[PDB]
Amino acid sequence: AFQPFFVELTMPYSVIRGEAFTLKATVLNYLPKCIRVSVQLEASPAFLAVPVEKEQAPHCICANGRQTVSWAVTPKSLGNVNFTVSAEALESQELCGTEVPSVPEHGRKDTVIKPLLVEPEGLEKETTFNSLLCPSGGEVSEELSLKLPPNVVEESARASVSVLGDILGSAMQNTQNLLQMPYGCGEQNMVLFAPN
């Protein structure tokens, strides 16, 4: 499948809130009608946008021509978040090519909305303890509670627990490999017989 008048936005997959960066998305015209396209993005309060080549207007994009503009960016929100861009042909700018009809299909303007996971800023270190309890005829009880807020950045904490017996997490293959009828000298048989 194709799209006639669209913005193909590509970028890294996951970013960080703290530091700033730029991204670069492109509008694509596979049509010999050579169009000046005014690309922009609709920025939410989740981030602030500042461009680097928006003072100058784009010129035109003929068949397979493409006008691309960079946008420095720093986010503030978190989580699975959407991403915004814009695209549409424009009329009456006869300065670049010979003409510009500027009428793709009724969905001529292309406004893409793309997702994003944004893991956090800062030094990701961890915390973890454990314990084992078992009565045969009664009850036991554990308690783990780790208060570690030294001069912190908030919304960082997360654990994900395990009630587990790791006797056989992935222990099938030794348990049905290590079986043999012995061979050779005495020490050979002892290694072939003792693990069993």
């Binding site: 030094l123 990701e124 961890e126």
Partner: peptide, 11 residues
């Protein structure tokens, strides 16, 4: 656990 540190050490 998963958590974050280092907001300072800029003196």
């Amino acid at each position: 656990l998963k958590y974050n540190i280092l907001p300072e050490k800029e003196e």
